[PDB]
Design an enzyme around this catalytic site. Structure first.
Site, PDB file in Angstrom:
ATOM      1  N   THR A   1      43.753 110.913  51.269  1.00 27.17           N
ATOM      2  CA  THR A   1      43.513 109.751  50.364  1.00 27.17           C
ATOM      3  C   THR A   1      42.052 109.310  50.390  1.00 27.17           C
ATOM      4  O   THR A   1      41.420 109.289  51.447  1.00 27.17           O
ATOM      5  CB  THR A   1      44.414 108.551  50.738  1.00 27.17           C
ATOM      6  OG1 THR A   1      45.791 108.936  50.631  1.00 27.17           O
ATOM      7  CG2 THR A   1      44.159 107.356  49.828  1.00 27.17           C
ATOM      8  N   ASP A  17      42.053 108.251  44.427  1.00 29.74           N
ATOM      9  CA  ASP A  17      42.467 109.582  43.993  1.00 29.74           C
ATOM     10  C   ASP A  17      43.982 109.572  43.789  1.00 29.74           C
ATOM     11  O   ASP A  17      44.628 108.539  43.982  1.00 29.74           O
ATOM     12  CB  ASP A  17      42.042 110.655  45.000  1.00 29.74           C
ATOM     13  CG  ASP A  17      42.944 110.712  46.218  1.00 29.74           C
ATOM     14  OD1 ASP A  17      43.098 109.677  46.902  1.00 29.74           O
ATOM     15  OD2 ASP A  17      43.498 111.797  46.491  1.00 29.74           O
ATOM     16  N   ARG A  19      46.330 112.232  44.985  1.00 27.53           N
ATOM     17  CA  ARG A  19      47.031 113.236  45.788  1.00 27.53           C
ATOM     18  C   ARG A  19      47.778 112.578  46.942  1.00 27.53           C
ATOM     19  O   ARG A  19      47.216 111.752  47.654  1.00 27.53           O
ATOM     20  CB  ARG A  19      46.043 114.259  46.354  1.00 27.53           C
ATOM     21  CG  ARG A  19      46.687 115.292  47.271  1.00 27.53           C
ATOM     22  CD  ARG A  19      45.667 116.261  47.839  1.00 27.53           C
ATOM     23  NE  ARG A  19      45.263 117.272  46.866  1.00 27.53           N
ATOM     24  CZ  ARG A  19      44.361 118.223  47.098  1.00 27.53           C
ATOM     25  NH1 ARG A  19      43.750 118.304  48.277  1.00 27.53           N
ATOM     26  NH2 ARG A  19      44.063 119.098  46.146  1.00 27.53           N
ATOM     27  N   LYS A  33      48.101 105.198  43.543  1.00 32.23           N
ATOM     28  CA  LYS A  33      47.733 104.489  44.769  1.00 32.23           C
ATOM     29  C   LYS A  33      47.238 103.071  44.525  1.00 32.23           C
ATOM     30  O   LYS A  33      47.082 102.296  45.471  1.00 32.23           O
ATOM     31  CB  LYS A  33      46.680 105.288  45.529  1.00 32.23           C
ATOM     32  CG  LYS A  33      47.227 106.603  46.043  1.00 32.23           C
ATOM     33  CD  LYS A  33      46.167 107.421  46.746  1.00 32.23           C
ATOM     34  CE  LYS A  33      46.582 108.877  46.804  1.00 32.23           C
ATOM     35  NZ  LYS A  33      45.800 109.607  47.831  1.00 32.23           N
ATOM     36  N   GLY A  47      47.036 105.658  54.427  1.00 33.09           N
ATOM     37  CA  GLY A  47      47.879 105.736  55.621  1.00 33.09           C
ATOM     38  C   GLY A  47      49.313 106.076  55.258  1.00 33.09           C
ATOM     39  O   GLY A  47      49.553 106.907  54.380  1.00 33.09           O
ATOM     40  N   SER A 129      41.047 109.286  54.366  1.00 29.48           N
ATOM     41  CA  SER A 129      40.461 110.496  54.949  1.00 29.48           C
ATOM     42  C   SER A 129      39.140 110.890  54.286  1.00 29.48           C
ATOM     43  O   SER A 129      38.290 111.522  54.914  1.00 29.48           O
ATOM     44  CB  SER A 129      41.451 111.666  54.870  1.00 29.48           C
ATOM     45  OG  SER A 129      41.926 111.849  53.546  1.00 29.48           O
ATOM     46  N   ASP A 166      37.002 116.374  50.620  1.00 30.95           N
ATOM     47  CA  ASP A 166      38.099 116.085  51.551  1.00 30.95           C
ATOM     48  C   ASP A 166      39.384 116.768  51.090  1.00 30.95           C
ATOM     49  O   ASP A 166      39.791 116.613  49.938  1.00 30.95           O
ATOM     50  CB  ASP A 166      38.322 114.575  51.665  1.00 30.95           C
ATOM     51  CG  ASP A 166      39.463 114.218  52.599  1.00 30.95           C
ATOM     52  OD1 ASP A 166      39.537 114.802  53.700  1.00 30.95           O
ATOM     53  OD2 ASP A 166      40.282 113.348  52.231  1.00 30.95           O
ATOM     54  N   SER A 169      42.363 114.629  49.886  1.00 28.11           N
ATOM     55  CA  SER A 169      42.180 113.956  48.604  1.00 28.11           C
ATOM     56  C   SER A 169      42.021 114.975  47.482  1.00 28.11           C
ATOM     57  O   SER A 169      41.472 116.055  47.693  1.00 28.11           O
ATOM     58  CB  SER A 169      40.943 113.061  48.663  1.00 28.11           C
ATOM     59  OG  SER A 169      41.015 112.179  49.768  1.00 28.11           O
TER      60      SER A 169
HETATM   61 MG    MG Z   1      39.905 117.720  48.159  1.00 24.64          MG
END
Ligand code: MG
Ligand code: 39V
Ligand code: MG
Ligand code: MG
Ligand code: MG
Ligand code: MG
Ligand code: MG
EC number: 3.4.25.1
Lengths: 226, 204, 195, 196, 222, 211, 233, 195, 196
Positions: A1, A17, A19, A33, A47, A129, A166, A169
């Site tokens: 995230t 994002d 995902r 989100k 989280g 993250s 990341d 994400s």
């Molecule tokens: Mg990524």
């Protein structure tokens, strides 16, 4: 995230994002989100997904009842105080890490809140993250006295940094803009830079390919008359 | 030891053109031992279908619980519950056991009787909703099902075509999982007719 | 305790249960009956941790006997099995769970059909033609998978049971001291005195 | 974290850095660790941010309710409320708090409340992970009845060194002056204090 | 405490044809949730018309490939430039892996080439040397996502001929190189969607009697 | 896995499944768990795939050298013992093997069970693997010495099937072998999926399953 | 097996059209204590290679000595030591990578993360990473520790793929590196303001810059921030 | 392995050893001979961890057979028992000790006396009229303490052994699949084919 | 333990406390932590007394053998021998050593060798458990090219504070002056340094 919050001239903007993961596996490629606490108070969560939702719905429910009791529009500091006291009581076992933002009669506000109950104030924040990849962008390009259009650009650029760099994400960018004296505009899938390419082949099967043993009609209707 | 993989099992759901499909294997085991080849994991409450994977006692318990709640809903509301509403009820009921959860992976499937819109949804054991347009997977071969569904699925499939796609996704995923198989069932669901088909598969 | 078997034939249910009770390195008894009559046409065999087994069995027995008196009516084997499952599913999330696995064998006098239910300590219920708990099924299921027919007689079910027991006595390292066998049919419950 | 409170002729000054860490990552580089529990009673927080915030919020509630009934509370009274929370919940807390306030009767006072929940009244106090590096400096350079400007320089020089050696400390130096004149907030940036 | 192992992610795929063989793998290298490289080759031409890929812990994978390439070099010196057959390479690799039975190479290895009859060959290994020849094999992070799809689309498993209804199976018709590369690209595009460690790029090595050819295709970088 | 072997009038039958597992994931379904040591010697694999494969190939070389030196084929007893002594060096070091050395020598048909724990046992009937417990039931009830080669091959095949059905970590296909005094004979690969339905219909067994 | 004591944080680097840039701060941390303030973590090898090292400083000093000895040994019986048979970045890297993997295989690692930056004989850019596990990889941008999380995202906006390298000048690349070092000073608790920067160009050679400082920092907005939620004063 | 018994009577030594070999939940064999002939008038039975048992027994056997060939002379049971003890006392402080307990039964042709030695895995030697290893002695020693005379015949020793075995088969939870019985006297070693 | 070495105009001065502890018990209150490895090369020892004594004894042996063959060793050479022992045996040692010496060519030099076995050449160095409390004081008060008397006062004041705050430090303050003139031992008692 990856989630971010950015203040500007006449308001505040948040972004995230889309995902959601189950270890290395992507469960949902277009998760939402950005949650609504009240009409002009929105929060983004990282989280434990169930906790960020449940804690948001609960505080949003109590905020609505409070708004009705007091005949006033809800304040961001109320949502903040109610969230942190709830989270603190559960000693971090409710794994909700949120960025809370909104506008109210007092003005525009931007807070972060951690699972143990600590809160922070800022002009620009990042959680999840991909927070480090996003914060690198914010620290590079953020300035004082941003415009609405500059802030949306900064926020989505910060989310993209998380999306590309990341692994936790990915997919799309959601945005919500909360400006003073205006309705909040929720921009679902503001950016769509990760559309799947056309497959090389169609895997539609010939009818009758699958072996079958029994067939039967399922009665979903109620008990009938006559 | 891991409650989510003692009994084994899988569930998969898919959307089509004015239709939905939901399917499950029939295995119930005690780790390596196969116990029953008739343990259906899909239940229905009116026109809303619920598939549940994971710990079998919790599967059985939750079915009895949602039968309880949907029967009362219907008596008070004077109408059958819809998939969107049932999905929120499942999420609510799972999160109320946040710190002592049911070890399950539920999957909702159905068609809204008013809008006619096909609907599927998935959950983690703690209530987090996954509202997908395409497909939902759950079970010990969830990784296998994700790979099959992501490559075989295409939108707006007709009922008889959707049947073949979901059946092949399940069968080939189950055959790469030790804890899934021993039979399979597929529900094809339309606005006012539902067909149930038992598949022929390898029994090892 | 160790081995409990069950087999549903044409017109009856046969339950076979080991006779041994063991505490450490010593066999305390070699004639233990690991079963309670819940109602005249419903029998439950059990196995698990000491104390928990008998305490749970007799608790269930008392509840079913209470229902029978209150309504002057015998519950169906399916109703009893569902009651038992709920008690175990309730128990597993309690402070100290009952460590008991059971088989419920009954004759439904309404449908005129024998019925066999397998329920483990987690509250995992399954209706079967034949079943076992613990390490028992590991040796016996291959023979049952081979020889079993749903139209078998009681005498054929007993011969298949003798075969299952003979295999256990050969390949199991533990001496369970033979089995007590009980048959549940339309006329009630009886014990096979020679096995 | 690097925090301190120093009494002087006209009252008391609180000082703090602005760094908050999650391991080696700086979660916030412009934190405000100087928190108000009453008009002229402030505290410096160290330890668990969640614990110290929850505590200060409760104390602010108690002193607001105290004021409504009995009038302006003493700095000793505020320190007692902090202690009562820190001591009775010592098994579930990680909080190191410095309490500082100004009365007209008692003038500037400073109380420190370390981990166990004990209370210690002092002329000046230092706490936080970075305080260790300035025990020697502060002891050698502290005097009683300093001027405002002398005390500001003392805190500035002290926290400058704490920040220099402690990785958990850094950012800007915030200060809060408590006198009869009122409440003055100060801030000092890296380019000023690093070259000292 | 020092952990000598790591996980660099990645996924590889080998398919054997009638007169050819492919070995594909993504070009992404990772630790935890970070990306190290978007293009770090993982499949190598080892010589004698053999391609190889050791997927898992990159340091152990690099060492194994390096040792096998060296083994091919010394096979030529010691046996008069004789060509190392694919079956002989597989057996040699088993002994490279088991020589560290008590401190293993944490990798899943796949080699591909042509057998001594000119037919396509794929061999797969476990980290300690158990090997087997196969027609189709996926290894690595997303191996469990891809293999069931290959069972269905390469070996026609659970597929029967319409009209018969489960009485007659679908016949095992061989695949062409063009049809195989399609399955490879669709496999990796699907794996990229649902696995976070898979993406960035796809590099395929095709082996025929004419030699070793390469093909590269981009993948999603999220 | 499920593997078995038994001696009888006309030699020794050897059967095994073909499933390989990595947790709940089925890694392979085409694996060979019977090993060809020499034209008169077979070895089964159970437990560690790598361990069993490496050490039995090491044994096969050992057996070949023996033939060169002594101008004589090694006995089943000596072969099994070489393996047992080889793995005994590495006892407690983590090896995982459960094998059967099957062959025909001067003493007639021979069958030894050998494992990484240190056991080395001669016997007329063995089964090793996670599914061994299911296979033993069919063997013990139907095993005789005066068994025809046709009936013996079926017994070993039917026994694997029983285990493949119940055991989650057993299945795929059945590999059959018959060891005679003239050497071993391979009797084919039999897919369990197809075999199950065939046996169900012809034999009448597995009544509880629907087809 | 050991634990690192005195440590060095991020090393960051990137390729540009004619060469490579690499940078690292001058700090030697002792846990949370910012102990040593004059530590050089960029070590040149000849006039064509710079090795940047993070992690344990005692192991860094050991590696620094291996490299110094490598140059000495290469000159032995080598008339072309300052020409055709001079040390290449690829030679230096493979040597280190061999040592790192051997040490991890003896369960006695050199607790470091290393980036070898240089330019080859043919003018090709060299940039490769190696660490305590013997894990190696190459990319247009490389960074260790915190740099991997914060610097790479910023440097990848300049050079996202291989084809962006010729389009990137030395002024743009240095600007990006210097900005990344500022961000790390904002956000890495084990970093310092003072740092060193090295450029290896195929035309202008090796330029080694010492005593650089992070400048143009934004702190003024801190004055407006008050409390942690409800506080106004 | 499980149970090994020994009894010295007037003119012979009788050793009784269980037949079962077990790996986990499965009985691999039910006709295992847990003994090696060390010399024509010396027999050793053994029990312990798999592998170690047979490896140690055959190692001892080879050493005694080597001594016999070299000297053309049979060692006394006392000499053999001392050699065995030293090997075990050496083993216990080694990297991986032999986990084996043994009974050595022999007839000394010089003294014309039977002799029975009990040696555990630590190298603890004791000469006895009767002995056992593991959980065996716990059940059998009370009967032996009661019935044993040093002037017993071989047939009386066998009857007392049948009694000891009958008690084991009743109170031991594990099925050891009966025993193989061997007698060591002046004429050598022989096996009782019916027991 | 509190130890330090400081370079100045005419050479270098080593300083140390005299306390050795076994937990909270003071096993020796008059320890000599300033140890000689060569005529004008001394070291301050911290960490395990057994380890640091064994090391210094080996170093003294190496430099004695060096001198017999190659003449007087440099301070850098001495620090290298210490390092080689501390680095190669880092898994089995707990030693924190400061090396200090005087040449006529290089004058006063100071090297510090912390736990890992790294070497750092410095104008002055501090180490031991009590050094933490004087990082701020020493950084603020150190100057280059001080006089002998200024440097003595600097060390005296610094170690005074370290002793004041650290329980593991105490006793007397020992000092060793290293110049061209020779080697001078100094000692300062509690009644002198406590009142500073
Ligand atoms: Mg990524
Ligand atoms: C049954 C499937 C299960 O008992 C059977 O025994 C087969 C036997 C067999 C399989 C292939 C070839 C020959 C025989 N066994 C397996 O499939 C085993 C399961 C297993 C793994 N470890 C283990 C097993 C069984 C008993 C003891 C220990 N599979 C393997 O051995 C293979 C697949 N190896 C691995 O999965 C891995 C190894 C080896 C290894 C891994 C994974 C990772 C790191 C180092 C080594
Ligand atoms: Mg199976
Ligand atoms: Mg700092
Ligand atoms: Mg050998
Ligand atoms: Mg003894
Ligand atoms: Mg002291």
């Amino acid at each position: 995230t990856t989630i971010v919050g950015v203040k500007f001239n006449n308001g505040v903007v948040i972004a995230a994002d889309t995902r959601s993961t189950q270890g290395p596996i992507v469960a949902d490629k277009n998760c939402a989100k950005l949650h609504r606490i009240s009409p002009k108070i929105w929060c983004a969560g990282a989280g434990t997904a169930a906790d960020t939702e449940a804690v948001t719905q609960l505080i949003g429910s109590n905020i609505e009842l409070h708004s009705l009791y007091t005949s006033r529009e809800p304040r961001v500091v109320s949502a903040l105080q109610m969230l942190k006291q709830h989270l603190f009581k559960y000693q971090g076992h409710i794994g909700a890490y949120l960025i809370v933002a909104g506008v109210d009669p007092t003005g525009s506000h931007l807070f972060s809140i951690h699972a143990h109950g600590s809160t922070d104030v800022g002009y620009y924040l990042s959680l999840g993250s991909g927070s480090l990849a996003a914060m690198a962008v914010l620290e590079s390009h953020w300035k004082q006295d941003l415009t609405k259009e500059e802030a949306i650009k900064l926020a989505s650029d910060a989310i993209q940094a998380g999306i590309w760099n990341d692994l936790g994400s990915g997919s799309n960018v959601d945005v919500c803009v909360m400006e003073i004296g205006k309705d909040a505009e929720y921009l679902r899938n503001y950016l769509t830079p990760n559309v799947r390419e056309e497959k090389q082949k169609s895997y539609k099967f010939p009818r009758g390919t699958t072996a079958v043993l029994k067939e039967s009609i399922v009665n979903i209707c109620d008990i009938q008359e006559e | 030891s891991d409650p989510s993989s003692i009994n084994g099992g899988i569930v998969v759901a898919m959307t089509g053109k004015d239709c939905v499909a939901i399917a499950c294997d029939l295995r119930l085991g005690s780790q390596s031992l196969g116990v029953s080849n008739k343990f259906e994991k899909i239940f229905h409450y009116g026109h809303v279908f619920l598939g549940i994977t994971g710990l079998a006692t919790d599967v059985t318990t939750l079915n009895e619980m949602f039968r309880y709640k949907t029967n009362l809903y219907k008596l008070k509301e004077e109408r059958a519950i819809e998939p969107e509403t049932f999905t929120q009820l499942v999420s609510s009921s799972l999160y109320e056991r946040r710190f002592g959860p049911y070890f399950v992976g539920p999957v909702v499937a159905g068609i809204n009787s008013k809008s006619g819109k096909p609907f599927i949804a998935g959950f983690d054991l703690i209530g987090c909703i996954d509202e997908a347009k395409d497909f939902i997977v759950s079970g010990t071969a969830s990784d296998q099902l994700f790979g099959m569904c992501e490559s075989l699925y295409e939108p707006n499939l007709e009922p008889e075509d959707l049947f073949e796609t979901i059946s092949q996704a399940l069968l080939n995923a189950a055959d790469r999982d030790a804890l899934s198989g021993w039979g399979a069932v597929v529900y094809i669901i339309k606005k006012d007719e539902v067909v149930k088909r038992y598949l022929k598969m390898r029994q090892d | 305790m160790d081995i409990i078997l069950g087999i549903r034939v044409q017109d009856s249910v046969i339950l076979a249960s080991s006779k041994a009770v063991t505490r450490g390195i010593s066999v305390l008894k070699d004639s233990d009956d690991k079963t309670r009559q819940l109602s005249p046409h419903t029998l439950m065999s059990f196995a698990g941790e000491a104390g928990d087994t008998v305490q749970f069995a007799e608790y269930i027995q008392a509840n079913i006997q209470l229902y029978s008196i209150r309504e002057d009516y015998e519950l169906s084997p399916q109703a009893v099995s569902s009651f038992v499952r709920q008690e175990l599913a309730k128990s597993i999330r309690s402070r100290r769970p009952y460590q008991v696995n059971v088989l419920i064998g009954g004759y439904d006098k309404k449908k005129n059909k024998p019925e066999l239910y397998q329920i483990d300590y987690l509250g995992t219920k399954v209706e079967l033609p034949y079943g076992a708990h613990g390490y028992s099924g590991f040796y016996t299921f291959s023979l049952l998978d081979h020889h079993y027919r749903p139209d078998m007689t009681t005498e054929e079910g007993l011969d298949l049971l003798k075969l299952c027991v003979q295999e256990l006595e050969k390949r199991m390292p533990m001496d369970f001291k033979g089995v007590i066998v009980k048959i549940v049919d339309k006329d009630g419950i009886r014990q096979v005195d020679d096995f | 974290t690097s925090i301190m409170a120093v009494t002087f002729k006209d009252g008391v000054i609180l000082g703090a850095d602005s760094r908050t860490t999650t391991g080696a990552y700086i979660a916030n580089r412009v934190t405000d660790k100087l928190t108000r529990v009453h008009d002229k009673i402030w505290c410096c927080r160290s330890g668990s941010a969640a614990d110290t915030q929850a505590i200060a919020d409760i104390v602010q509630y108690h002193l607001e309710l105290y004021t409504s009934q009995y009038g302006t509370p003493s700095t000793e009274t505020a320190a007692s409320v902090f202690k009562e929370l820190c001591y009775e919940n010592k098994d579930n807390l990680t909080a190191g708090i410095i309490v500082a306030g100004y009365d007209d009767k008692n003038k500037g006072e400073v109380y420190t409340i370390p981990l166990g929940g004990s209370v210690h009244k002092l002329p000046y106090a230092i706490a936080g992970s970075g305080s260790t590096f300035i025990y020697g400096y502060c002891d050698k350079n502290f005097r009683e009845n300093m001027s405002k400007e002398e005390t500001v320089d003392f805190i500035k020089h002290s926290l400058s060194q704490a920040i220099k050696w402690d990785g958990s400390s850094g950012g800007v130096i915030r200060m809060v002056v408590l006198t009869a004149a009122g409440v003055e907030r100060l801030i000092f940036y890296p380019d000023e204090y690093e070259q000292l | 405490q020092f952990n000598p192992y790591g996980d660099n992610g990645g996924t590889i795929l080998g398919i054997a044809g009638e007169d050819f063989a492919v070995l594909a793998g993504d070009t992404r290298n990772i630790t935890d949730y970070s990306i190290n490289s978007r293009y770090e080759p993982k499949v190598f031409d080892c010589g004698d018309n053999i391609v190889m890929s050791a997927n898992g812990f990159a340091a152990d994978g690099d060492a194994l490939v390096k040792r096998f390439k060296n083994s091919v070099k010394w096979y030529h010196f010691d046996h008069n430039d004789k060509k190392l057959s694919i079956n002989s390479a597989a057996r040699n690799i088993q002994h490279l892996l088991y020589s560290r039975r008590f401190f293993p190479y944490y990798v899943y290895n796949i080699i591909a080439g042509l057998d001594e009859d000119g037919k396509g060959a794929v061999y797969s290994f476990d980290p300690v040397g158990s090997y087997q020849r196969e027609q189709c094999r996926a290894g690595g992070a997303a191996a469990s996502l891809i293999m069931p799809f290959l069972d269905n689309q390469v070996n026609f498993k659970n597929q029967y001929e319409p009209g018969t209804n489960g009485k007659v199976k679908k016949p095992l018709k061989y695949l062409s190189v063009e049809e195989v590369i399609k399955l490879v690209r669709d496999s990796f595009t699907s794996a990229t969607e649902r696995h976070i460690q898979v993406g960035d790029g796809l590099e395929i090595l095709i082996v025929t009697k004419d030699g070793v050819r390469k093909e590269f295709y981009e993948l999603k970088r999220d | 896995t499920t593997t078995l072997a038994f001696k009888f009038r006309h030699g020794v039958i050897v059967a095994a499944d073909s499933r390989a597992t990595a947790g709940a994931y089925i890694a392979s379904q085409t694996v060979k768990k019977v090993i060809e040591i020499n034209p008169y010697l077979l070895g089964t694999m159970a437990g560690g795939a790598a361990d069993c494969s490496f050490w039995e190939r090491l044994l096969a070389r050992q057996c070949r050298i023996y033939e060169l030196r002594n101008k004589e084929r090694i006995s089943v007893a000596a072969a099994s013992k070489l393996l047992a002594n080889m793995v005994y060096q590495y006892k407690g070091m983590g090896l995982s093997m459960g094998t059967m050395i099957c062959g025909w020598d001067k003493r007639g048909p021979g069958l030894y069970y050998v494992d990484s724990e240190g056991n080395r046992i001669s016997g007329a009937t063995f089964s090793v693997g996670s599914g061994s417990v299911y296979a033993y039931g069919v063997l013990d009830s139907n095993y005789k010495w005066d068994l025809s080669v046709e009936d013996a091959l079926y017994l070993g095949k039917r026994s694997i099937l029983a285990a493949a059905h119940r055991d989650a970590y057993s299945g795929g296909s059945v590999n059959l072998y018959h060891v005679t005094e003239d050497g071993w004979i391979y009797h084919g690969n039999h897919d369990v999926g197809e075999l199950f339905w065939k046996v169900k219909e012809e034999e009448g067994s597995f009544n509880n399953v629907i087809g | 097996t050991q634990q690192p004591i005195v440590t060095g944080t991020s090393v960051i680097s990137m390729k540009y059209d004619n060469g490579v840039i690499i940078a690292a701060d001058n700090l030697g941390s002792y846990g949370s204590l910012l102990r040593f303030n004059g530590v050089e973590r960029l070590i040149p090898v000849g006039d064509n290679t710079v090795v940047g090292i993070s992690g344990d400083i005692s192991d860094m000093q050991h590696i620094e000595r291996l490299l110094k000895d490598l140059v000495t040994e290469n000159a032995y019986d080598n008339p072309l030591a300052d020409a055709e048979e001079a040390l290449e970045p690829s030679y230096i890297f493979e040597y280190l990578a061999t040592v790192m993997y051997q040490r991890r295989s003896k369960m006695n690692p050199l607790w470091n993360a290393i980036i070898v930056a240089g330019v080859q004989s043919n003018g090709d850019q060299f940039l490769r990473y190696v660490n305590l596990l013997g894990v190696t990889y190459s990319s247009p941008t490389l960074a260790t520790g915190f740099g991997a999380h914060m610097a790479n995202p910023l440097l990848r906006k300049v050079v996202d793929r291989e084809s962006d390298i010729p389009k990137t000048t030395v002024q743009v690349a240095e600007e990006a590196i210097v900005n990344a070092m500022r961000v790390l000073y904002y956000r890495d608790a084990r970093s310092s303001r003072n740092f060193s920067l090295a450029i290896i160009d195929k035309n202008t050679g090796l330029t080694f810059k010492k005593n650089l400082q992070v400048e143009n920092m934004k702190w003024d907005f801190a004055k407006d921030i008050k409390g942690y939620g409800t506080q106004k004063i």
